[PDB]
Design a protein around this ligand. Structure first.
Ligand SMILES: Cc1cc2nc3c(=O)[nH]c(=O)nc-3n(C[C@H](O)[C@H](O)[C@H](O)COP(=O)(O)OP(=O)(O)OC[C@H]3O[C@@H](n4cnc5c(N)ncnc54)[C@H](O)[C@@H]3O)c2cc1C
Ligand SMILES: Cc1cc2nc3c(=O)[nH]c(=O)nc-3n(C[C@H](O)[C@H](O)[C@H](O)COP(=O)(O)OP(=O)(O)OC[C@H]3O[C@@H](n4cnc5c(N)ncnc54)[C@H](O)[C@@H]3O)c2cc1C
Ligand SMILES: O=c1ccn([C@@H]2O[C@H](COP(=O)(O)OP(=O)(O)O[C@H]3O[C@@H]([C@H](O)CO)C(F)(F)C3(F)F)[C@@H](O)[C@H]2O)c(=O)[nH]1
Ligand SMILES: O=c1ccn([C@@H]2O[C@H](COP(=O)(O)OP(=O)(O)O[C@H]3O[C@@H]([C@H](O)CO)C(F)(F)C3(F)F)[C@@H](O)[C@H]2O)c(=O)[nH]1
Lengths: 391, 391
């Protein structure tokens, strides 16, 4: 009678987490529908033929979390390396330590500042706004690093990445970056961090490995939901695609940013001597450059070639794949509307919304996985197992 | 009849490794004689009363090795943290990335150099000498980092640390430092690295914990060897004290360097924002400064106080404790003599020589432990177990 117990739209970390938990902990059959030719969403990786180096096809993916439960969960499917992510910043022909630390300060200001002297210097340069009263990105950034540093490393980068007035961008975007007064130049500040030892695709394939999970690549949910759902009428639907696209943009177009990549194999062994180099100056079109050999130093790749990737940012069109939610005031207002329509869809046909795209949220991998675990624990499992309504 | 099966002089890592292996693997009674009030030699650590921060009393101790067997052995007695040692260098009022890397190069030379451009620049500045033909420290350093960088970060530091012409110092001293053309500023380049989770003293106390091992603090071997050895005539002696001091300096005085430390608790939470800051300029008397809170960031120490330690270097006197072997041509010549007298002592009264002091070798912890394992495997064990002579 009932073919599946649950439909999941999208095979990203949210979708796979949901699909894995349901199938493995509740002994239920889950159908996962993926539009792309591969699973894993933007986390999908692929070895470059010439060099053998693993390439994060949709931009650099670095896993990190302070959530012990998430860390323990993800380690069920993959090992993690010793890698600690660091970023350098290119400004006026000089490579700077990054982000905010004694390294960045001493370089940019020409002399060594003690932790105490550094705190005083920034406090002076952050006088025009206090951190608590920070409404947007521009105000919050200046309140944390000061206007001179904001001018040189934030204002330009933010322009290329968003093409939106920094006074209209959320403050949460800039607070993704740690603000320190030590020489610690770790780009993240979570307890647990590392790269998947055998790569991202292996990790992802292990999450969807269970026999009760079926994944259909090259399949849009909208093309087949008419045919599928009557086959399993009681089965709920977890949707992780673009939230506005789901309702045919009937309330308006949410602001998204999309990315274009240029992948190039170079006849030299080392291009920039580090994994990610940010480009903060507007005299260059790309936001940053990835050199993927530096992601996995524990592996010994060939030393005569190397793979680099330039990252370009622009507004997402109707045919584009959305990467970043812009989340301006207008966007947040429009989101509130779709939230209501999504809330209605949950009660009318048991359709759930989650993930970066499904919630218009600037989510990372760990945040997406944690979110999926919460939806499983508090919503999905009680429904599928104990009959409880989804609301 | 026979009280002990082996005498060990000195409770450093060599001595303890020897004592542990013999007692634990051969079921033999070992007496360890320590002159100091504590075990562990220079690796002894101690919590500072006000702050609670662990202080490496005899200078910063960072464990690292590429030897899998050593790593597996030491982990039997302690856990290791995630710590990766990094050093910054102070020169003309600016804090530099260190050692040789794209960080140091781009800072000191004012602009960003690509890995390829960096290799070319140094090759030009290292033209006066090729690395293979490097006889001493000065020549080897210039051949690896170039004369301008040698002038600014090596020549001055080496003067304060050795007070000896760099043309008379061994090349092995400068090759302790990694030479890179990436942004990797890890001060070491071994596979395994970290700090003892519960501190060095706990680690050391676990190695000497066995009931067949007796350690006598506050005891000089020379004071009691007359009384002890007839109590166990068949028992060999492993000596890890100063090699020249053993023979009453009868062949001459080996050149040593000793260290003086200044420990100060400051009413601020952070002094330099990093564990070790080198001071390469001669306008300051100390070689470097340690801030021990940065050694263990995983621990949460108080943020209103901090412990720092200034390191001063000088020649070791007859009453001083030797830290570094200088190993000049004259020193190596004198060492050859003591080697012969030591070789004679092995055949006349079964006295072995090992460790940093006992062999006049610039040894690290892992090298000292590896050395002790080799002496156990190839010399001590066959003797104590299979009667084989020590030669
Ligand atoms: C450039 C970049 C770098 C990042 N780096 C990091 C990092 O270093 N560390 C970190 O923790 N996070 C990072 N992130 C964030 C992270 O990638 C996201 O959290 C992650 O993609 C979460 O997956 P998601 O489940 O929200 O689904 P997503 O992976 O965003 O994709 C889900 C899938 O849904 C599918 N789909 C959509 N619509 C349909 C449909 N109609 N029918 C069928 N399938 C559909 C898509 O094919 C897509 O594959 C980065 C993001 C970007 C853009
Ligand atoms: C400032 C400094 C920093 C260092 N940092 C590192 C580091 O970061 N990482 C690393 O791997 N290595 C480091 N080292 C090197 C390391 O400390 C040595 O390898 C280590 O001390 C090895 O111990 P050892 O067994 O050779 O004996 P040592 O520890 O040098 O001491 C042995 C003991 O013999 C005892 N003794 C001597 N004579 C007598 C006697 N007549 N009677 C009784 N007892 C005697 C002494 O009391 C002494 O305690 C550092 C060394 C110094 C000086
Ligand atoms: O140099 C910078 C870096 C960030 N920012 C601002 O901060 C915002 C968020 O930065 P964030 O680094 O998290 O951007 P992201 O693409 O979401 O993060 C990604 O950036 C990669 C890389 O290490 C860093 O270059 C990454 F690892 F893939 C990432 F962190 F996921 C960004 O939109 C900018 O407005 C700057 O202004 N300047
Ligand atoms: O900045 C430097 C550093 C080293 N050198 C030269 O290199 C030689 C050896 O250096 P090395 O760092 O191993 O000296 P060491 O005291 O044996 O090493 C110790 O130095 C500590 C710290 O991190 C680095 O400041 C340490 F960790 F404790 C150490 F590595 F054990 C030194 O004698 C100098 O001649 C310089 O010229 N300049």
């Amino acid at each position: 009678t009932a073919r599946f117990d649950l439909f999941v739209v999208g095979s990203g970390f949210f979708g796979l987490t949901i699909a894995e938990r349901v199938a493995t902990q509740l002994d239920k059959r889950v159908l996962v529908l993926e539009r792309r030719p591969h699973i894993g969403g933007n986390a999908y990786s692929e070895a470059e033929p010439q060099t053998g180096i693993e390439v994060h096809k949709y931009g650099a993916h670095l896993f990190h979390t302070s959530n012990k439960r998430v860390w323990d969960y993800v380690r069920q499917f993959t090992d993690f390396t010793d890698y600690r992510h660091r970023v350098f910043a290119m400004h006026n022909g000089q490579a700077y330590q990054f982000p905010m630390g004694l390294g960045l300060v001493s370089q940019f200001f020409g002399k060594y500042f003690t932790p105490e002297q550094a705190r005083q210097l920034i406090a002076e340069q952050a006088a025009e706004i206090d951190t608590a009263d920070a409404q947007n990105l521009e105000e919050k950034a200046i309140s944390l690093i000061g206007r001179p540093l904001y001018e040189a490393f934030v204002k330009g980068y933010t322009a290329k990445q968003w093409q939106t007035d920094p006074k209209e961008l959320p403050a949460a975007n800039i607070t993704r970056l740690p603000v320190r007064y030590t020489f610690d130049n770790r780009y993240f500040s979570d307890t647990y961090e590392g790269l998947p030892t055998d790569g991202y695709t292996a990790w992802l394939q292990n999450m969807a490995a269970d026999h009760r999970i079926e994944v259909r690549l090259n399949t849009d949910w909208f093309d087949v939901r008419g045919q599928l759902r009557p086959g399993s009428p009681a089965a709920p639907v977890v949707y992780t695609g673009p939230l506005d696209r789901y309702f045919d943009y009937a309330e308006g177009r949410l602001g998204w940013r999309t990315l274009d990549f240029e992948v190039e194999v170079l006849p030299i062994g080392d291009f920039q001597g580090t994994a990610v180099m940010n480009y903060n100056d507007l005299d260059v079109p790309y936001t940053r450059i990835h050199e993927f050999r530096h992601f996995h130093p524990e592996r010994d790749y060939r030393t005569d070639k190397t793979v680099i990737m330039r990252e370009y940012s622009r507004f997402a069109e109707d045919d584009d794949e959305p990467y970043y939610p812009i989340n301006t005031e207008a966007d947040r207002a429009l989101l509130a509307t779709y939230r209501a329509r999504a809330k209605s869809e949950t009660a009318s046909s048991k359709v759930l919304f989650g993930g970066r795209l499904g919630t218009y949220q600037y989510l990372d991998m760990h945040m997406a996985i944690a979110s999926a675990l919460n939806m499983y624990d508090n919503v999905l499992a009680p429904h599928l197992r104990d009959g409880v309504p989804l609301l």
